[PDB]
Amino acid sequence: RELEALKQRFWKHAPGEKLQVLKAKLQEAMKLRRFEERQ
Amino acid sequence: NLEDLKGHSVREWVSMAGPRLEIHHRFKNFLRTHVDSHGHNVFKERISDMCKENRESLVVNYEDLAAREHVLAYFLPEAPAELLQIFDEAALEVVLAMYPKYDRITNHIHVRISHLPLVEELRSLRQLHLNQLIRTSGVVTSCTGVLPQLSIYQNYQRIRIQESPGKVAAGRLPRSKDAILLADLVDSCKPGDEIELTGIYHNNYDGSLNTANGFPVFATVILANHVAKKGELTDEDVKMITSLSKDQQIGEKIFASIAPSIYGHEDIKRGLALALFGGEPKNPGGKHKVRGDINVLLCGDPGTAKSQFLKYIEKVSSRAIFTTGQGASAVGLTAYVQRHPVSREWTLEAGALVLADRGVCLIDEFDKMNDQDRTSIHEAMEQQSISISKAGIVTSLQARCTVIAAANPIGGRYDPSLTFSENVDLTEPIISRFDILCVVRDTVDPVQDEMLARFVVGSHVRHHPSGVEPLPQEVLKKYIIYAKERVHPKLNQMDQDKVAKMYSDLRKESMATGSIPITVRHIESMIRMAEAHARIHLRDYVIEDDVNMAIRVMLESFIDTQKFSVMRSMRKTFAR
Amino acid sequence: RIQETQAELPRGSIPRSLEVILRAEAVESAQAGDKCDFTGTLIVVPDVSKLSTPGARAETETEGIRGLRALGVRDLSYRLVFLACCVAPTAESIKNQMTVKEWEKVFEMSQDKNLYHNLCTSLFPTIHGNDEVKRGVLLMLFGGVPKTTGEGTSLRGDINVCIVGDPSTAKSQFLKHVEEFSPRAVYTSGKASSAAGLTAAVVRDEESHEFVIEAGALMLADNGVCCIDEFDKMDVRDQVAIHEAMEQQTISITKAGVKATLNARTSILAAANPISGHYDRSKSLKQNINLSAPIMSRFDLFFILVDECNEVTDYAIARRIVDLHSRVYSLDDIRRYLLFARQFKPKISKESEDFIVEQYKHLRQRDGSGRI
Ligand SMILES: Nc1ncnc2c1ncn2[C@@H]1O[C@H](COP(=O)(O)OP(=O)(O)NP(=O)(O)O)[C@@H](O)[C@H]1O
Ligand SMILES: [Mg+2]
């Protein structure tokens, strides 16, 4: 019990990847808008 | 649907007629329909400003392009040389639709992207990034002349940028890259600048590298698309700025907004404000130039926030430099001569006072310079130039800056039993070149201690990572840049008899105590302070209120120079 | 470029060196000064400047080979290179590294009773007496939370500690002991062993007769702890530079060809000698030591160490020394626990403000009654 509580309060106090994250977000927006336009 | 990537690379896909036309229409419709949060059209205003000034260059923001037409924002970094071409073609006909005669001025318009999110460090570039749009930062070290390049002819310039000093690890060495500037980007920078560069990463063959390494290894370069340092005010900005000037208490709002976390010290904030806005330079009859800038000096006991104020001034102002005592040399302050690395001839280069130019030059531990280094600034502080004659070179350079300095009293603590000159140890040719002089002292009132301590403790709990009301700091920054560029105070008349009588009386008393000697410079200084107060109120003409303010500041700072026992009599003498 | 390590160089010989080539995922994994083991193959590379092809021409006491069409009437020579396919040294990270044993150990430490004294004993087992010094130096390792004010100025995090004492006694032991314990720490002295000393310096590089910087001790000790011995005797050039480095945690240079701002974010532990060697027990610290008031006012804590020849104490010290030569928590437990503790960022409570402001007011009025 108490060890996990200690971990929890401890965590409470505590190339190319950027383009991939950007692509994921924009592609989600693309999918949503083309779905709405299609209906 | 444009998104249907099948059987083709994106470079091939946007080459196809159908996709090219869809991209063209989408960007054009985005230009005409884009609205701000207020319901205002953004690009109507921006295009009209571009046309009125004949500037032939259109800036777009990546964030709201993505927010409204994400499919284009998705393709843009993957095939920049294609989408940027289509964008240029689309923008020119919107411009001609609004302004049908604009083809008389130019036949092409360039679209420039900004606030691109995927920033990269200047040593983390790899072959993974070739032929894509990137963003980096660094300081310029080499910069060719502007030369014409075949296409018709257009301007061309080449630069070299390296990692910003102090962002490399201690004791190791920096990386660097070359970049190319074309058309309206030339002379957007000069050596020693720190810049933010957006461009295309590009590579080509070079026999020298293959023969030097023995492996088939290529050379690379960056094609610049947008360059910005790390006015363009909207109608709403100038509207709010001008409306704020109506307030009769605007002086309290501006003064109370300088170094906000420092408690107390009203006089220091007031003096720094006047020095931040500044008086106006002039040359009556063409043969008799005089400077506009207002210099400041601070002196007093340790632990009183003197070093902190300079750091705030460095942050709020633009074109600022900071330096300390033994860390600077006469040659580094003014200008230096060297055997040029590749031209193999003697050449002259700018030091601190030249590199600052129309900016602020901050000095700390001013008491502890070598005297032979401190006497280098005498010309720059008054004649506002730097004259050099060395190694066959004979020339002069501009030094149009404001100097602010901080010092310590002799023996570490100020004594009110002695005058300023007795306590500071600086000679008259130095002391007389500062417009505002301040003295800061320890005090021992228990209620003041309790208030100061409670405020500091409050500040600590406030900033954990988690008088009148002051302005937000961005509003103040907008206000200063507007006031310095759009208002120029005129001194059409003032009472000569009043100032002359006061000056003669003041100078006579200065002879008696000898705390500071008073000279012709003091009159000209009051004229500068009067113009500065006029500029804070955004007024084109100086008035009676401004002259009274200038006299108050002058005399209040003068009384502090005297011995404690003398100050009462002096204060009653100069009743105002 | 690599060189023979100190262990291999045969006596009297000049060192040999080799060119190593790294590719793909291995790139920029080794820095100058590192010592590593490389795995790969030895290869032979031709002089590419004398070969000719349809795509590109040839550029142009030994002779090469002759008689290839691509070589014309020139001659070709080779050199040796080593192509390396692999190279190795010769918040979430804590969760990845700590097993259940380490988690249990830091939990037991968190629940421990009189943990402060237990850690003092564990970290400084050799030391005798002087508990106040042990508590003070132990606290320095935990630092203090830095804060950035909204207008962009910042507030200092590290504390600084000073120890003055007689050359015969304990002050040197603390410095060398904490340096042996701690990660990423530097030992030096006011009589420094380099042209840079305690803060950065400018040197002219003969490859171009161009001016460049060279790092001092406080630059290398950035994000670490710095131990300075014989601090009472120091160069004036560094002494002026220390005024800025102590509080602003930065160093500023403006000389011919060089203009820069450099970081010096460090916790300093200084050791000094009083005038005449032995501390005058009848006089204040400020009368005893050589330091000036501006430098002296920077430190958060001060301590004094001075000997006297008590027979039992001398006999006990001697027996401790000879017994040590005759032969709770381990240092790795302290390291793991310290790295765990430094992730917390505690706030002050509202009620604590009243006690803090009261104590400061009491101190200030005491000072005013007989500076702070
Ligand atoms: N009135 C104040 N309000 C807030 N912080 C203060 C105040 N007075 C002193 N400090 C703090 O005291 C520290 C030292 O500030 P500093 O600007 O170096 O004072 P100083 O008088 O210039 N010291 P020195 O350079 O040795 O003369 C900083 O952390 C300041 O924020
Ligand atoms: Mg200071």
Coordinates of C-alpha atoms in Angstrom, one line a residue, chain B residues 254-255 270-280 292-294 436 483 487 489 525-539 542 546 549-550:
Chain B
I254 CA 4.4 53.3 -16.6
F255 CA 6.7 54.0 -13.7
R270 CA 11.4 56.9 -12.4
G271 CA 15.0 57.5 -13.6
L272 CA 15.2 54.3 -15.6
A273 CA 11.9 55.1 -17.3
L274 CA 13.1 58.5 -18.5
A275 CA 16.3 56.9 -19.8
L276 CA 14.3 54.2 -21.5
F277 CA 12.2 56.6 -23.6
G278 CA 15.0 59.3 -24.2
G279 CA 15.2 62.9 -25.5
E280 CA 15.6 63.8 -29.2
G292 CA 19.6 62.9 -27.5
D293 CA 20.4 60.0 -25.1
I294 CA 20.2 60.1 -21.3
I436 CA 20.9 61.0 -13.8
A483 CA 6.4 56.0 -28.8
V487 CA 6.4 60.7 -31.8
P489 CA 8.7 66.2 -29.5
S525 CA 20.3 67.6 -19.7
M526 CA 17.1 69.2 -18.5
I527 CA 16.0 69.9 -22.1
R528 CA 16.5 66.1 -22.8
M529 CA 14.5 65.1 -19.7
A530 CA 11.7 67.5 -20.6
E531 CA 11.4 66.0 -24.1
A532 CA 11.4 62.5 -22.6
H533 CA 8.5 63.2 -20.3
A534 CA 6.7 64.8 -23.3
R535 CA 7.2 61.5 -25.2
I536 CA 5.8 59.3 -22.4
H537 CA 2.5 61.2 -22.8
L538 CA 2.6 60.8 -26.6
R539 CA 2.6 64.6 -27.1
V542 CA 6.6 70.3 -25.0
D546 CA 7.2 68.8 -18.8
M549 CA 8.9 67.6 -14.1
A550 CA 12.4 68.0 -15.5

